């Protein structure tokens, strides 16, 4: 179940966030913690491609090796809050599971600056959801969370101490495929 109406950043700069570059997940918190593994790797690219607002996702379970990419088209609900379709694709953009009405996520940018961000997502796959999932992002895959983003976590009435880090998982990312997938 998702339970939070996440508030977007006041004065969110959409062009900076959606610049075509990659964001790595450095820490995550699911309010239903059993919905996601204790060890995980994820990243995303966000940008406008031929006028269309897009996100490309990468997920990797470092223990099971389960791997998947997705291409998302985002619709705007309000500045910094989006509803995203998804299609599951291989790394080259070939469709494995097509867009369907019932497969979507909400996506809220709670805090961002040039190098870090705090987002919330609620994933729906038909009648199931993956709970309220918060993620701290950085442009640098190895960056420890700094004060701007940790303060944002506190301002959302969360505790960064409770987030699970992705840093000890030997996560390795294909940045080229994430960037290219924005066009797909």
Curated annotation (Swiss-Prot):
GO molecular function ontology, one term from the record: metal ion binding
Cofactor(s) the protein needs: heme b
Catalytic activity: 3 nitrite + 2 H(+) = 2 nitric oxide + nitrate + H2O
EC category: oxidoreductase
Effect of residue 30 to A/N: Loss of NO-induced conformational change and strongly reduced pH dependence for NO release. Stabilization of the ferric-NO heme center and decreased nitrite disproportionation
Spans traversing the lipid bilayer: none
Recorded consequence of changing residue 121 to V: No effect on NO-induced conformational change or on pH dependence for NO release. Increased NO association rates
Keyword Metal-binding tagged: yes
Pfam families: Nitrophorin
Enzyme Commission numbers on file: 1.7.6.1
Disulfide bonds listed in the record: 2-122, 41-171
Chain's role: Heme-based protein that delivers nitric oxide gas (NO) to the victim while feeding, resulting in vasodilation and inhibition of platelet aggregation. Reversibly binds nitric oxide (NO). Also binds tightly to histamine, which is released by the host to induce wound healing. NO release is pH dependent and linked to loop dynamics.
Family: Belongs to the calycin superfamily. Nitrophorin family.
Record's protein name: Nitrophorin-4
Provenance organism: Rhodnius prolixus
Source taxonomy: Eukaryota, Metazoa, Ecdysozoa, Arthropoda, Hexapoda
């Amino acid at each position: 179940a998702c339970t939070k109406n996440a508030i977007a950043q006041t004065g969110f700069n959409k062009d900076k966030y959606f610049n075509g570059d990659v964001w790595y997940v450095t820490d995550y918190l699911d309010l239903e913690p059993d919905d996601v593994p204790k060890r995980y790797c994820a990243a995303l690219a966000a940008g406008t491609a031929s006028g269309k607002l897009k996100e490309a996702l990468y997920h990797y379970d470092p223990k099971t090796q389960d791997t998947f990419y997705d291409v998302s088209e985002l619709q705007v609900e309000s500045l910094g809050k989006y509803t995203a379709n998804f299609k599951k694709v291989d790394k080259n953009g070939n469709v494995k599971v097509a867009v369907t009405a019932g497969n979507y996520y909400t996506f809220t940018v709670m805090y961002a600056d040039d190098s870090s961000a705090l987002i919330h997502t609620c994933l729906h796959k038909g009648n199931k959801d993956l709970g309220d999932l918060y993620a701290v992002l950085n442009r640098n895959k190895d960056a420890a969370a700094g004060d701007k983003v940790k303060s944002a976590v506190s301002a959302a009435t969360l505790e960064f101490s409770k987030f699970i880090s992705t840093k000890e998982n030997n996560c390795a990312y294909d940045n080229d495929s994430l960037k290219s997938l924005l066009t797909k």
